[PDB]
């Protein structure tokens, strides 16, 4: 077990701006009995990196301890090691990448020793996906099956590759570590091949830290920034990506940015939409907008109001007492034009439900 009888829709939001960036984020427990997600969102880093920013989403499993420790200390483990520092004044691309790798391996070992010392009872682990944004580069960081993407010139310019046990190189490591991949799971249990924590899967004698059943090793990609063309970055857990593809979500987010510049609201729209598309997991998303992110469009705002009015009239008529499920089903059969790209009817469910509720409050 572990599903609630009804989803917990409460949103935890944050927003901020600086270094030319604006961001919003939303997390929601949804159908799950526990919330095991965390995030980091910081504009302006310590120790001479004030023009830097860092954003990350951590999808915890078997507990929130690992995800919570990461969201508070991963960044310092990355920036405060000899690999990141190097190196004259400004960190080279190699310093940044090596520094991030060392940061992951060191925080993992750090947690392992803390747990050993205090006889920790939890056996939790966590994915991490994030971006370290410098004045000239965006470094995407991925460890696990959370995912991030960069929208540039209205297209998906880059997205992180999910670490899954069945991936060829992952399966190879797992087998060489004495394990197997059964369907999509390590030993028929873990659905992730890389994560922080999961120390029971990191006890293989004769294998280094990155050769275990589960690896803490991140994949890092440096993308040179384009002031003219960079639009936004989306970071989210698999609770989002399970039900929306890269291009769908990019298109959907664009469509929402053309209607509002409230980034928390856009993130809330993504999360609700994914819930309505059937996601039964915790959900978290961070949206980071660059200076040339899409701007609110008067025509887009009008089209949205026209659509909302149209849906309201349809609901009025369909009622003429069908439940909401049946009203949604009727609306779907109508093949209504001009729904949000990617979001589709699910992304309009809040509008529909609001009207339905005014008409059938009991
Ligand atoms: Mn998840």
Residue numbers in the entry: 2 to 321, 327 to 368
From the paper:
The PP2Cα is the prototype PP2C family phosphatase for which the catalytic mechanisms and cellular functions have been well characterized. The active site of PP2C is located at a cleft between two central β sheets, and it harbors a binuclear metal ion site required for catalysis. In addition to these direct interactions, the M2 metal ion of PP2Cα also indirectly interacts with Glu37 and Asp38 through water-mediated hydrogen bonds.
To reverse the negative charge of the D38, we also made a D38K mutant to see the mutating effect. To further elucidate the structural basis of the impaired function and catalysis of D38 mutants, we solved the crystal structures of PP2Cα-D38A and D38K with Mn2+ at 2.0 Å and 1.85 Å, respectively, and compared these structures with the PP2Cα-WT that was crystallized under similar conditions (1.95 Å). In addition, the electron density for the side chains of D38, A38 and the partial side chain of K38 are also unambiguously assigned in the PP2Cα-WT, PP2Cα-D38A and D38K crystal structures, respectively. However, in contrast to the crystal structure of the PP2Cα-WT, the electron density for the M2 metal ion and the phosphate can't be clearly located in the D38A or D38K crystal structures. In the crystal structure of the D38K mutant, the bridging water between the M2 metal ion and the D38 in the PP2Cα-WT was pushed outward by 0.7 Å because of the longer K38 side chain. Therefore, the crystal structures of PP2Cα-D38 mutants revealed that the D38A or D38K mutants of PP2Cα abolished the M2 metal ion binding by altering the H-bond network of the PP2Cα active site. However, the overexpression of an equal amount of PP2Cα-D38A mutant as the wild type only slightly decreased the EGF-induced ERK phosphorylation, and the overexpression of the PP2Cα-D38K mutant has little effect on the ERK phosphorylation increase. Accordingly, the D38A decreased sulfate binding by 4-fold, and D38K decreased the sulfate binding by 10-fold.
